[model samples]
Target chain A: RLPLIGVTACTKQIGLHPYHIAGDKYLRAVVNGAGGLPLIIPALGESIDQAALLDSVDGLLFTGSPSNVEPRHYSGPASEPGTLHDSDRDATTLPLVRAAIDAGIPVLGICRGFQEMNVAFGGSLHQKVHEVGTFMDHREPADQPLEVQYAPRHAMHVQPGGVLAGIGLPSEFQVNSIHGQGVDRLAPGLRVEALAPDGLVEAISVEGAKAFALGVQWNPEWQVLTNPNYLAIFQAFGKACSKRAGQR
Target chain B: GPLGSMSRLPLIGVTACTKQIGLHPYHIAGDKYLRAVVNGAGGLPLIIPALGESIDQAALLDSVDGLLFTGSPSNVEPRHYSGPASEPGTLHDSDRDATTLPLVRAAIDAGIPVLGICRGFQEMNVAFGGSLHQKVHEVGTFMDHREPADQPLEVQYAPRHAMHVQPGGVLAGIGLPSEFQVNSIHGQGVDRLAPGLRVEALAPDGLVEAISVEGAKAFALGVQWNPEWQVLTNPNYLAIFQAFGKACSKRAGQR
Candidate 1:
C-alpha cells in the first residue's frame, strides 16, 4: 500500500462552500496515476490526534480552498466584512503542516496551500495584488473558456534549469491562472523556481528539506492528467514519497 | 477608522456553483471574496478552501486566525430541518459536510470569529438547530429563485432591495442604519431561526436578512447579502470584515 497524503478542508464562504477538498483529485490522480493509494482527511475537532494521523500516512498534500489563511498567522490584522474566513479549518491544518515538516515527510502545497505553507513558516502574504500594482491577470475573464484543455491560457517563465525547469517542461509553459493571490515574497529557505511574465512568484521549493516539498500557484494536477510533462511533477513527487517510505 | 491600517480579511471555504453544470462543486476559490474583504478593510486578502475529509483539525485551525462561511449551490439536507429539496440541484457531499461541520463547531468553540453569507447562513442555521425555507417560492416568500435558467448574471454583486437593522443588534453596531440596500440572488432563505440564534436584520418583505448565534464566543454572524460584491465601494460592508480581522488579530495576540 502506498503512503497517503492528508488534505485540509476549506472554510465556508459567502458564495461558495467547502464542497470538495482542493488538490485531492490531482493528488489522487497523480498518486494513483503514478501507482499509489490515496487517503483523505476530514476537518475534525480539537480532540483529533495529529501524531497518530501523521503516523498513519506517509506524506501530506495541502490543498487549496476558498477561505484565506487568517492574517493573524503572519501577525496581520483581522478580515473585514464580506471577507470569508474559516477559523475551523485553519485550526485543524496548521499543526499538521508543522508535524509533516518536522517528520521530514514529502508535502505538496497548491495555490492556497502554497500561501499557507509560507505563512506557516513565519512568512507574510501580498493580500491584494491590484493594490500592489502588478500586471498579472490573476482573475479569469468571465468570457474565457473554462473546459478548454491546453489552450495556452496563460504563460509562466520557469527558472532556467531550476526544480520546475528540471521537470522537463518548456522554459515557458502555458498554465491555468485561477488565483488572485500569488507568492509575494520567497519565505525563508524557500527558493523561487518559476515566475509569471509579470514577475509574480509562480512556484517555490524548500532548499534543504529531507523530503520533496514543492508549491505551485497553478493547478498543475489538471495538466498532469492531460499532459505528460505536467505528469512528471506527480511522478517526481510520487517517486520521492516511495523512496522515503519505510526508511524514516 | 484607521485609514491605511485596515486589515484585509480573507474568508475560506465559502461554497460556489459552477456556471455551466449548476452543480455546487466544492471549491477552495475564495480569492475573489478575499479580495473584496481585504480591499474593503484596507488590508490584503487570501482564500483557502476546506477540502478533503482527512485534515489535521488542530493543525488546520492553527494555520489561520479568522473564519467565513460562503454560499454554495447545494442546499442543507432536510434532515437538519432547513426544508426539503424542491428543485433538482446537487446534494451535499457527505465527506465535505462531515469535515466542515466540526470545523464550524470548533471555531465557535474556540471563540474564533466567523461570518456566514447566503447559503453559508443556511448551513450555520442547520448546524445550530435552525431550518431553511428550502423552496422559497413554495414557502410564500418574496425572494425570486425561478428566473429563467438562462437569465444573465444580472445581480452579480449589486444590491437589490432594502434591509432594516434591528436596533442594538450587531447589524446596527455596523451602522447599517434602519434600512439599507442589499443584493437579492438566493432561492433559499432562513425559514425559522435556530434555537439561540437571533435575527439581526430583515428584508423589506420580512424575510430574515441576517442572523447571529447569541452568546457565541466570538463574532458569529450571517447575512443573506453578497457584501463581498460591493465591499470595494461600500464602507459598511467593509467595516464588517475589518471588525473580523481585528478580532482575528486580537485572538492571535492572545495566543
Candidate 2:
C-alpha cells in the first residue's frame, strides 16, 4: 500500500471541532519529507484489532499530542484537569508500539508517543517531571508566542555510541522543550540515546531493535528547517520507510 | 525493547506451502501460527512460495531482512540424499526442496538470518550436504513423533517428550534449560549434520531437536519441535522469536 505509515490519533472536541485527528505536522512530514502515505488511525479503544491494523501498515508513527498518555499505564500520578488523558489512544498505541517494533515496522514516537513507547515496554515515568525539579519545567508558554513556544529552548547531550551520535548526528544540539512528563526508571532493554543537561532522558532507542527505532522529547516535525537535526531525522525515517515500501 | 518507532520494518521471507483450499489451490507459505510468531514477535512475515529454481535466490535474498523455513506436512525427496524413502506415500514435495535448498544457502551466504522449522528444519540439514533418519520410528528408539489420526489438535501437539538443550549453543544462551518438555510431531530427523551445523538440543531418545549453523556469519537456527504454536503462550519460545526478530531488525538497516 505504498508504504502506508499508521499514525496514532487524538480525540478532540472543542467549541467548533470534534475529530479523532493526529495533527498535520507529523503527517505532512511523513508524506512530503519521507514520500510515504500517512493514514491517521482513530483513537479507538482496545476493540480495534491492533495486530490487523499493524499488519496492514508498513510503518508506525506515535505522534505528539497536547494530551498525555493516561499515567495509569505507567503507574504515575493521577490525572488532573489540565493533564489530558486519552485512554483510547493509550489502549490502541501501547501494545501496537511493542508489536510494531517486533514486527520490524520503522517506528517513531514523538512527545506523548515517546512516553507511550516507554510505558508499553515496562518503563515508568514522572507525571509532573518539572515538579520533581531534576529538570526545568519543559512546558512551552503557549500564550507567549507561536514561534517562541515551538522554538528550540535548551541543549541536549547525546550519549556516546548511541544511535544519534552513532548515526553521526551532532550529539549536542539545541532542542525544543515541552512537557511536564519525562522518563523515570528506564526499562532495562531501553538504551538512553540522549539526555538533557539536567540528566533527564531526551532521546531513546530500543537497546537492540533491528531497524531505526528512535524517540525524541522534542518535536522535529514542527520545524524541519529550524535545525539540520530536524530534517535529518525525517530524512532517515523516509529512507527506512521507502525500503519497506519497495518490499511491499 | 520498544523501538520508539521509525524501524524499516524488515520484510522477513517465510517459506510457504502449495496447498488446496475448498475447490481452489494456491501456493501459500505462511500458516496462521507462523504469522503470529513472525509479526507478533516483530518481523514482517513475507510468504515466499516454492517457485522452483525459477525463483531468483539472490534477488529474493535482496528483498528480505531474514528467512523463515516453515514446517510442512511433506518430506524432502529421498533423491536429494542417499537415504531410504521414509515411507511409501509419505507426501514428498520436491518443488519445496528445489526452491528452499538454494534459497537457504544463498540467505546464509548473504549473512541473512535463517530459521528452519519442522520439514524446513530437515531441509536445512539436507541443504548443507547432511542426511536424514528417513523415519525416526524405524531407527531412533524415539517415540513416534507423528500425529495419531482421529485425535484432537491439542493432543496432536501436546507435550510429547523432553528435549535437552545442548550446552554452549544459541538456545542454551537464551535460557532454555538444558532440559525442557516440547510438543514433538515430526517423522524424519537429522542423521548426519550438514558439514558445519552443530546440534543445539536432543530429544530424550537422542534425535536432533534443535541445531545452529556452525561458524555462520548471522543467526542460522532450526528446531524440530513445533514452537510456533505456543509462541504467544510460552515465554521461552517468545524469546527465540524475539532473538530472531532482533537479528532481522538489526539487518534491516543494512545494504
Candidate 3:
C-alpha cells in the first residue's frame, strides 16, 4: 500500500456554507509523482487532533492557498489593503507544522505553506516582497491566461550540497512563481536550499530535521507531469514518506 | 481596555447546577468541567449561576466567548418535552431546565460557540422541539447507559461503548475513525432528533451520540458521552475541548 500523505486545506465560504478544500493539482502531485495516497486535512483550527492526525499519516504536504497568513503570527505589519486571509487555516497549520517536524514526519510546503513554515518557527515575513527595496516583484502578472500565469516565469538557483541538490536537482532551473509574500527573517533552524534571482528565499530545509522537511516558494504541483524538476521534488518527498512508513 | 487587546484566552461560560445543600439551594459547577475548560481546552472557565428567568440571558451571552452546558446528576423534567411523567423521587432540576433550554436556542441563534454534554445534550434537543426516550434502558432494544453501581470514578467514566462517527460529518471532519470508544452516563436518549440538527455520531445500539446545529454560524455541538472526565488523558476527549476552545477564540476575535 502506498504511504498516506496528509494535505492541509483552507476554510472558505463557498456559496452559503464554510468548506475545507485543496487544489486537485496538489493531490495529484502526491499520487502520481510522490507515489502516496493523499488525505485532505480540514481547516478546523485547533479542533483537529494533531497528535492523532500525525500518527495516521506518514507525511504532511501543506499546499498553497489564495489567502495570506495573518500578520499577527510573526509580529509583522498588517497585510496590504484587500489582501485575502484565512485565520482558521492559520490556527491549524502554524502549530501542526512544528509538531510534525518534532515528530520526524516528512513534510513538503508550497507557496503559502512555505510562508507558514517560516512563521511557525519564530521567523517573520515580508507582507509584500515587491515593496522591499532589493527584492524583485514576485507577484504573478495580472490578467494573464491560466497557462501564462502559472508558467515557469522565474529561475531558481538551487544551492549546492542542499536537499534539492541532494535530490539531483539542477543548479539552476525555471519554476512557476505566483506569490505576494516571501520569507523575511529566515527561521533560525532552516537552511536555505534555493534562492530567487532577486535574492529571495525560494527553497529551504530544516537544519537538523530527522526526516525530509522542505518548503518551496514556487508551485511545483502545477503541471508537474511535464516538468522533471517538479517530479524530482515530489519523488524525493514520496521516498521520504515511504521511508517513514517502513519505520512505522 | 478594548476586548481581545489583553490576554487572548477565550472566556468559556460553564452552565451551573442548582443543588440542595444544608437545606438551601446552591449554584455550583463541577470541578472536572472547569478543569476540562481550563486545562483541556486552554480557556478560562466562568461559572454561570443557575438563576433561571431571573438572570439576563442576552447580557450573559454577550459577556462570554463560548457556552459550555455541563452534565449533572439531575435530569431535565419530562414536561419540557411533553414526555410521560417521571417515577416518584426521580432527581430533577427545573431551574437548569428553565435556564439552559432557552439559552441553547439563543446562543446558537447568535452564533456563540456552544458545547453540551449528557444532560445538556438532551436539553439541546428538547430546546429545538425534539423529544427524548425519558428512560432509554426501558426501551426494548436500547442498551442500558447508566454508570455501573458502586464503581470507582475512573471505571464509571471509562470508555464503555463504540461511537460510529457519521460519514462526511463534523466528527468525520475531525479525522475520527468510522468507529471509536466513548463514555456513556445517561439513562435518557434522543428519540426524535431535531429537524435543524445533523447527526455526527451514533452508538452501537443506534442511539444518537453526537450532533451539531445545521447551518449554525458558529461552533454548536452536543455529545451524549462524558468527554469532560479525564479529558487530557484521552486524545478523543481532548480533541473535542481543543476544538471548542479554538471556536471560542474565533468569537473573542470578533468581539
Candidate 4:
C-alpha cells in the first residue's frame, strides 16, 4: 500500500467565498516523487488535536503559502503592511508540528512551514528578513511568470557535519528563493542544514526528531517533476515515511 | 535513448489527435499526460500522427517496438465498425480512423505489444470487425461517460465508477482487483465482441471496459477509462503503464 502523506492547506478568499485550498502542484510532488498518497489536511477548528491528526496519516507535508504566520505567536515587531497572514492556518499547523514531532510522526516542511517550524520551537522570526539583515531580501518578483519566478535564485553552502552533509551533495548548490520572512533567532534544537553565502539559513533539520523531520525554504514541489535535487529531497522524505510505516 | 543509461530505450509510438494550434490547424498531437505516463514508466515515446497516407506500416512496425492508441475528444467514424449512419452532430475523425485502423491491424499482425485507451480502445474494436454503441448512455442503464461540463479538470477525471475485471485476465494478472473504482471518460463502448477478442473487464452496467487479443503473441489490450489522468498518483494506473513499458522493453531487446 502507498504511504499516506497529509498535506496542509491554506484559507484564502476568492470572490465572495472563503475556502480552504492546497496547491495541486505541491500535492503532486509528494505523490509523484515520494510515492505516497497525498491527502489535503484542512486548516480549521481550534479544538483540533494535532496528535489525532498525526495518528491518522503516515506523514505530514507543510506546504508553502502566500501568507505568513501572524506575528501574534512570536515576540517580534509588527510585520510590514500588505503581507497577508493566515492566522487560522497558523493556529492549526503550529501545534500540529509540535505534536507530530513529539509523537514521532515524520514531518516535511517547506517555505512557510519552515518559518513555522522555527516559531513552533520557541525561535523568533524577523518580520522582514531582507530589510532587517545584510542578507538579500529573497522576495521573488510577482510580475514574472511561474517558470521564471521558480527558477534557482541563489547558491547555498551545505554546512559540514550535519544531516545534509552526509547526502554527498555538491559543496555549493543553487536553490529558488521566494519568501519575505526568515529565521531570526535560531531555535535551541533546530540545526542549520544549509545557509546562503550571505549567512541566511536556506535549510534546517530538527536536531532530535525521531523520524524524517526536514524543512526547506524553497519550492521543491513545483520542480519535483523535473529537477533532480528537488526529486531527491522528496524521495528521501518518502523513504523515511516508508520506514516509519514498516515500524507501525 | 536506450534501455540503460547509455543504451537506446524501447521506443513506444502513441497515436495522437489532430487539433487546431494557436494559429496552426490540422496539427497532430497526443495528450501531455499520456506522453508523461509512457515516459515515466521507462519507455521512450514516439508520437504517431494521423498521416494515414504517408506512414509506411511495415517501416513503423520495424522502427518502434510497441504502439499505444491514446484518448481523444472525437470518435472513430462509425463506417469502420459497420454501425449506424453518423448522427447529425456526431463528431468523428475519419482521418484518424484511416490511419490507426490499418496500423492496429499491422501492429497485431507483427505480434508487438499494443495498448489502447478511450478512443484508441474503440478503434481496436472496430479494427477487428467489432461494433460500438454510438451513445452508450441511451441504453438507459449505463452512465454517460463524457466529462461533465463546467467541472475542474481534476474533478472531471476523478474516479466515479467501478469495473469488474475478469479473473485470470491480463489486467487482473497485473495485480488489479476483480472489482475496482476507475475513472471513465468515453461515451462509446464495445457493443459486440470481436471474433478474436476477449473481454478482460466490464462496467457495472455491462459495457465492455477492457479487452485483450485472444490469440495474440504479445500484450495487446484496450481500456475505456483514462488511466493517464492520475498516472503517477494511482498505483493501478502506474502498473498498467509499467506493464506496457515492460512489454515494449522486451520487444526492444529482441530487435
Candidate 5:
C-alpha cells in the first residue's frame, strides 16, 4: 500500500462556516518528494480520536500556518497586538506531536509546525525574532514579489553527524528565512540539527527517536521538484514513510 | 538541578481520560496525579493521553520508568470483561479501555513498576482476565462505594471506610495495622480476581480494594481508594506512594 500521510490543517473562517484547509504546496510535496498520498487532518482539537487517526496514516506532516501558537502554551511573552494565533490548531498538533513521535511515526514539521515541535517537547520561542536584536530580521519582505519573498535568502549551518548532515545535505546551505518567531529555549529532548546564519535554530530532531522525526523552520515544500535542498528533505521523509508503510 | 541531571528523576507516565469540555473533547488527568508523582513519589509525571491502541506501546514503555493509572470520572466498558450492560446513566470511556487494558498487561510483562488508583485498580483486575460488579452497591452485602454527590471536594474524598490489609502483601508491608481507613468513591468493584493476581487489601464488606500481579518482577499494586488525595499529609497514603516511589526508583536505577 502507498504510504498515507496526514497533513495538519488550520481552521479558517470562510463566510459563516469554519473550514479546515491545507496548502497545495504541501500536498504536492507529499506526492512528489515523499511519495505519499496527502490527507488533511482538521484542527478538531481533542474532539477527533487521535489513536484511530494514527492508525490510518503512516506519516504526518505539520504544515506551516499564518497563525502562531498561543504564547501561553510556552509561557513566552504575550504576542504583539494583531498577531495571528490559532488555539484550535495548537490544541490539535501539540499533543499529536508527542503521540506521533512516541508512536514511532515519521513526522516532518514546517514553519509554525517547527515552532510547534519545539514547544511540544517543552521548548520555548522568541515571540518576535526581529525584536531580539541579536537575531537578524527573519520575517519575509512583505512588499516583495512572491518569487523574491520565497527565494533562498540566507545560510543554514548543518550540525555534523546529525540527522540532516547524515541525509546527504552539505555542511552549510542557503534557505529561505520567513518566520517571525525563532527557537529561544531548545527542548531538552531535541538535538539541534541545523542553525540559521544568525544562529537561529532552523532544524531539530527528537533525541534517539527511532523513526524519522524532524522539524524545519523554512519552507521545503515550496518548489520541491526544482530545489535540490527542498526535494532532498522530502525524499528522505518519503523514504521513511515508505519504510513505515512496509512495516505495517 | 543542573542540565541533564533532570533525567535522574524517575519518569512516571500518568494515563489520561478523554472528556468533553465545551464542545471539544480534551485528554486530561487530574492535577492530583501530577502532585502525587512529584510531592508523594518524588518523581516526574508525564501525561499519557487516552489515544487508544494506536499508542506505540513499545516506545512508550521504553520512555518511562513507571506507569501511574489515575482515577477518572469514567468507567471501563462492560464488553472489556464480558460483564452485563451498565445502568443507563453509567459513565464509560471506551478509549481509555482500549489503551489501558493492553497497556497494563504489557507494563507488567516489561517489568515496569505500576500503581493503579480507583478506576485504575479495576482496570488492573480486568486487564488480567478478571470481571467487575457493574454496580457494587447493588450487590447484596456490598457497601455503597460511590462518593456523596455534589458535596465539597474535601468532604467527598474524606476517609470513609476501613481497608482490611492481607498479611505479607504490599499494603501490609507499609507497616500500618492490618486495617486502616480509606476513602471509597467508585461504583464498580472486583468480582473475580484474575488468577494471575493476588489480593492486597479488601473493603469491610469483603469487596477487593487492592491487588498486585502475582510474581510481577516490579511493583504492580492497585488500590481501590483515594490515597492520591492529600497524599503528602496522610501517613498511610504517603506510605503507599513512598513504596511506589521506591519501586520506581529501582527501575530507574536499572535504566
Candidate 6:
C-alpha cells in the first residue's frame, strides 16, 4: 500500500471553531493525482509530537492559508494590518515543517505554504507584494467568472533544466499570479527555479534532499485533473514520497 | 519581437458586460488575478468585450490558449417562458447574451479549457441544454438577492457548509472535500444541469454550487463562490487553479 501523504490544518482561534477547518484541495489533489492518499493533519497544539506525526506519513504538503508565521520566529516588524497572523498555527506548523524536512520527507509548499517554507528555512517575506515592489493584482475581479480560474495573465521565465523544467513546462511560460507577499531574500541553500516577468521569485527548491522539495507562489492544482503534464508536479512529488517510503 | 520566436505571452479571452445601474459601464479585469492564473498554470489572460459582433471565434481561439467566461452583473433571461421583471433593479445585457452561443460552441468544439463564473456559471448551463430558475427567491424558498453587496453575505467556507462531493467525481478525484463552505450571492441557481455534466460541489440547501462536464476534451468546472478572494488562503481553491495551470502546460507541450 502507498503511504498516505499527511497535510496539516490549522486549529481555530477565538471566534473561529473546528468546523472552520477544511483540508486544502490543491495539496490533496497533488498527492492523489500523484498516486498518494491524502491525510488531513490538524493542529494538535502542544500535543502534536513532531517525531510521531512524521513517522506515520511518507510526505508533507504545506497548503496556502490566511495564517502567517508569528514575528517571534523571525526578528522582524510586528504583524502588518490586513495581514492575518495565526500564532497557534505558526507555532505548530513551524516545528512540523522543520521536522519533516529534517526527517528527509519531501515537502511541497504553495502560496502561504511557500512563504512559510522560506521562513522555516531562516528566510523572511516582504509582507506585501505591492508595498515592496512593482506587483500585480492578486485579488480576483468582484464581477468576473470564477470558473476560468486557471486562465493565465502574466509570463514567467523558468530556468532551463531546473526541477520546474523537469516537469516539462516551457523555458518561458505564462502563469497565474495570486500572491500578495513575495520572497525578498531567498533562504540560504535554496535556488530560484522560476521568476515572474517582473522578476519576482516565483519558485524555489532546496539544494540537496532525498525528497522533492519545491515551493510555488502560484496555484497549479487546477490543471492537475485535465492536464497530465501540469499534473506532473504532484505526480513527481508523490513519486518521490513513494521512493522514500520504500527505503524506510 | 521576432515573429514566431517572439517571447511575448499569449492573451486569454474573458467575457464581461455592463449590468448594474450605479456600477461602472465597463469593468476591466485586473491583470494580477489573470497573472496568477496564467503564470501559475502557464498561460496568459486577455479581457474581451462581452457584447461584440466582431468576435471571430476561430481567430480568437487560435490566438489564445484558452477561454474564460467571466461573471456578469446581469441575470440571464429566464428560459423560454418570459415573465415580468422579478426585481426592480436587475440589469440585463442582451448584447452580451448574443455572443454566448457561438463563443461557447467554438470553445467547446475546439477542446480549449472553458471556465464559467457566477452569471457565467448560469450561462454555461443554459448554453448546454440546461434550464434555470429565473427568480430563485420568488419561485423557490430562499433569501433576498438584493442585500448589501459588500457584506459577507451568508455563505461560509467551513466544512459544515460545504457541498457534498460526488464519489469518483472529477472534483473528488481532484480532492474537493465532501463538504466545503462557499458564498451564495446570486438569485439564479442551476435548475436543470446540462447533459454529460456532473455535480462537483453542492451547498447545504441542495443548490448546485459547482459543476463540470465529464469526459470533455479539456478542463471545465464552475463554482458559485468567489474562490479567488481567498484562493491563496485555501488549498482546494488554489489546487483548482494549479490544476488548470498544469493542464495548460500539458496542452502547450503537445503543441
Q: Provide the lowest-lDDT 10-residue window in model 5 chain A.
A: A12-21
Predicted candidate 6 versus true structure: per-residue lDDT over B128-191, tens digit per residue: 7777776766655544433245434233332234556667766788876776655455667777
Which residue runs of candidate 1 sit more than 4 Å off their true CA positions?
A1-23, A27-248, B1-31, B41-52, B89-96, B141-156
Residue A83 displacement (Å), model 2: 50
Q: Candidate 5, residues A1-248: lDDT per residue as tens digits?
A: 56878788666553322345566567668877888766556566765457756755789999887789998988888888899988888999999999999898999999999999999999999988999888999888987876788899889999987789889898988998778888999999898999887889989999988899999999998788999998999999999998998997
Task: List clash counts for every candidate, in order.
Answer: 89, 16, 1, 7, 0, 48
Judged by whole-model lDDT over C-alpha atoms, candidate 1 comes out at 0.63
Sort order, lDDT high to low: 3, 5, 4, 2, 1, 6
Worst window of 10 by summed lDDT in candidate 6 chain A: A13-22
DockQ: the better of candidates 2 and 3: 2
> So what's the TM-score on candidate 5?
0.58
Off by over 4 Å in 6: A13-16, A142-145, A148-150, B1-255
Tens digit per residue, CA lDDT, model 5, B168-187: 88777778678889998888
Worst 10-residue lDDT window for candidate 4 chain B reads B21-30
RMSD of each: 13.0, 17.5, 19.7, 14.6, 12.0, 17.3
| TM-score computed on alpha carbons, candidate 6 | 0.48
- The residue-level lDDT of candidate 2 at B230 comes to 56
Q: Which candidate leads in DockQ?
A: 1
Q: What TM-score do all the candidates reach, one by one? A: 0.54, 0.52, 0.52, 0.51, 0.58, 0.48
lDDT assessment of candidate 3: 0.83
Q: What lDDT tens digits, residue by residue, belong to model 1 across residues A99-184?
A: 77787888877777788778777677776654678656665455545555224467878887567777777787777766756566
Model 2, residue A139: distance off in Å is 65
* lDDT at B121, model 6: 73
